[PDB]
Amino acid sequence: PAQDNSRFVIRDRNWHPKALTPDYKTSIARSPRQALVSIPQSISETTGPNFSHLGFGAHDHDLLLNFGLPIGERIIVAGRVVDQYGKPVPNTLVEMWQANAGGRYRHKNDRYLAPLDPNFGGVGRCLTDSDGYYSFRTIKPGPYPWRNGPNDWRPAHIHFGISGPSIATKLITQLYFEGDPLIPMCPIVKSIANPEAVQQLIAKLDMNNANPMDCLAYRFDIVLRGQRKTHFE
């Protein structure tokens, strides 16, 4: 079974978005009013599931084949998952979901007028390799109108979920695309107080990883909390 052999560098709550960010309307009623209670790291917090034996399908990471061809901009989304120490995070679960080319999600609750794509589901999963590398093949999502302010539009984005070595490292975030003008006007993006932090959510155009006459590529690296051994405890 798992063992308490590591400590995780303490999260920076001024870096991540705060709980209460009023421009993001829903955060108003869904943010704790009391202060979080700090607790020392224990085996409970420093262990987590290892998905090495999960039986992944052959097309789990390929959104072009996993749901004819989807209509939209064919792109690969690749990157690496490292810790704050710069160390690779191998055999880790990376999950993603997103709208179609027109900004419509394959979800009941999605009533946007843009149509669904018969050949597109919008979900993928990939276990990082030895070197912390992951990759997905998909189509670039479209911006989506949402009921926040009277004319709010989410920039095109991909939702990501990353496990890491422990529950202490587990993270959910979103990927944005380089140069999207909607980026700076989004209340969700704006939940991040530091513009430098925003930059880390931007995927960059990667011509080097593109397949000529086929698809473009975007690079997105993820940094999880730094992992160190215990000392003098």
Partner: protein, 200 residues
């Protein structure tokens, strides 16, 4: 001082999280292997229990698009990290609230006792991470059991909450569902009876 590479910032899971992590719920076809709410197979050692609850917002309204993740030790107080659908017991699970009733459920066994870093035994507990639209960064909490009062009184973790009244928010209420041992654990995000959320 020494500065490390900064951690990638958290973003809300959003309203459609189900599409990626709770396929059934999204009302989409599932894959061969899915991580879900049944941690224990009927033949798993320990005391089989059913866990259920609701999640409330600051207005006292149900949160029906909530996503939850659990991490607990087995009946021997052991963390089983090698996730396999073949195992009789998995330490990790996932659940979500009904778009209708807005109640989640988990099928597992009562976790055994684990010690803290200092060698002190912690009362049986389940670690919970809550995600959802309007939640920028997920909330961490622990589920404790009302019938482990003696253990609870001495938990090094519970003992860190300054106000005794706030500790009560972490205690699940034992009941029975169809003649099965069940525990109800409601989560109040904000306001009256707000649940203790942790940072670690």
């Amino acid at each position: 001082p020494i500065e490390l590479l900064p951690e990638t910032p958290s973003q809300t899971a959003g309203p459609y999280v189900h599409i990626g992590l709770a396929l059934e719920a999204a009302g989409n076809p599932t894959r061969d292997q899915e991580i879900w709410n049944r941690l224990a197979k009927p033949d798993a050692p320990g005391e089989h229990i059913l866990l259920l609850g609701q999640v409330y917002d600051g207005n006292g309204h149900l949160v029906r698009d909530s996503f939850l993740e659990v991490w607990q030790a087995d009946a021997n107080g052991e963390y089983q990290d090698a996730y396999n659908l073949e195992n009789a017991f998995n330490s990790f699970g996932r659940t979500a609230t009904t778009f209708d009733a807005g109640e989640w459920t988990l099928h597992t066994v009562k976790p055994g006792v684990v010690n803290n870093a200092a060698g002190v035994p912690m009362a049986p507990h389940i670690n919970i991470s809550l995600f959802a639209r309007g939640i920028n960064i997920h909330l961490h909490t622990r589920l404790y059991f009302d019938d482990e009062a003696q253990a609870n009184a001495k938990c090094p973790v519970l003992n860190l909450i300054e106000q005794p009244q706030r500790r009560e928010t972490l205690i699940a209420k034992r009941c029975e569902v169809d003649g099965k041992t069940a525990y109800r654990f409601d989560i109040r995000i904000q306001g009256e009876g707000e649940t203790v959320f942790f940072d670690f």
